């Protein structure tokens, strides 16, 4: 369970990052073509192109900020598979770092991708670096505001309570499990003190229900989802 020796050749490292999914502390060592996640029990290597999507959202707890990475293939921890990695930072923790890149290399190969020197909130530095190396856009909260200006509403999926973010183009739920449902997949939304939101998928794939959403949220949630020409009911 020694995590390992200093990652001296990494472009940049983020030590002791709290991952909520999978749950553990990982060092994130970022290289030219890959990222290594090093923990005391498990470790992984990802190719940049393996990151399919990057989502950056404030946590509903007013304290943390989350970065969510959709990965293909998913990551395996024993018999459990993880198509999303969820990283958590305190919203105001900061990283000041000079990238480990020689001047010539930086100029020829990274100048439009990365900064030489970062000094910002850690989640911002990491998302900037990942956007630069993976070429994926970073998805952020959109136009949806609850009643009480929040990015997400509390609910349950199966036996597990969590938070549902109506993003500009998708439903995003975390954490057990983590779910991303693009609106393009949504046949209709069967709606039904609290209420339930059944996301009926196109082509009879089934439904994903986000249950026990406060009734204090239903009309706004309805108006937004309407604004996306989905269905409702």
From Swiss-Prot:
Forms a stable heterodimer with SPT16. The SPT16-POB3 dimer weakly associates with multiple molecules of NHP6 (NHP6A or NHP6B) to form the FACT (yFACT or SNP) complex. The FACT complex interacts with the CK2 (casein kinase II) complex subunits CKA1, CKA2, CKB1 and CKB2 and the components of the transcription machinery CHD1, CTR9, PAF1 and CDC73. The FACT complex interacts with the PAF1 complex. SPT16 interacts with SAS3 and POL1. Interacts directly with RFA1. Component of the FACT complex, a general chromatin factor that acts to reorganize nucleosomes. The FACT complex is involved in multiple processes that require DNA as a template such as mRNA elongation, DNA replication and DNA repair. During transcription elongation the FACT complex acts as a histone chaperone that both destabilizes and restores nucleosomal structure. Signal peptide: none annotated. It is found in: Nucleus; Chromosome. It comes from Saccharomyces cerevisiae (strain ATCC 204508 / S288c) (Baker's yeast). GO terms for biological process: chromatin organization; DNA repair; DNA-templated DNA replication; nucleosome organization; positive regulation of RNA polymerase II transcription preinitiation complex assembly; regulation of chromatin organization. This is FACT complex subunit POB3. Its main location: nucleus. One of its GO terms (cellular component) is chromatin. The chain holds residues 232 to 473 of 552 of the full protein.
């Amino acid at each position: 369970a020694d995590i390992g020796e200093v990652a001296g050749d990494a472009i940049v490292s983020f030590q002791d990052v709290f991952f909520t999914t999978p749950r553990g502390r990982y060092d994130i060592d970022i290289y030219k073509n890959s990222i290594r996640l090093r923990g005391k029990t498990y470790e992984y290597k990802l190719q940049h192109r393996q990151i399919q999507r990057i989502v950056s959202l404030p946590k509903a707890d007013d304290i943390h900020h989350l970065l969510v990475l959709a990965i293909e293939p998913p990551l395996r921890q024993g018999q459990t598979t993880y198509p999303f990695l969820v990283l958590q930072f305190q919203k105001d923790e900061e990283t000041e770092v000079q990238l480990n890149l020689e001047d010539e290399d930086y100029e020829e190969n990274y100048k439009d991708k990365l900064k030489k020197q970062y000094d910002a909130k850690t989640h911002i530095v990491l998302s900037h670096v990942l956007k630069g190396l993976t070429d994926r856009r970073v998805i952020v909260p959109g136009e949806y505001k609850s009643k009480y200006d929040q990015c997400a509403v509390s609910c349950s999926f199966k036996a597990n309570e969590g938070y549902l973010y109506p993003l500009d183009n998708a439903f995003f739920f975390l954490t057990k499990p983590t779910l991303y449902i693009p609106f393009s997949d949504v046949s209709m939304v069967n709606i039904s003190r609290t209420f339930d939101l059944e996301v009926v998928l196109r082509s009879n794939r089934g439904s994903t229900t986000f249950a026990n959403i406060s009734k204090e949220e239903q009309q706004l949630l309805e108006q937004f989802l309407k604004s996306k020409n989905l269905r409702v009911k």
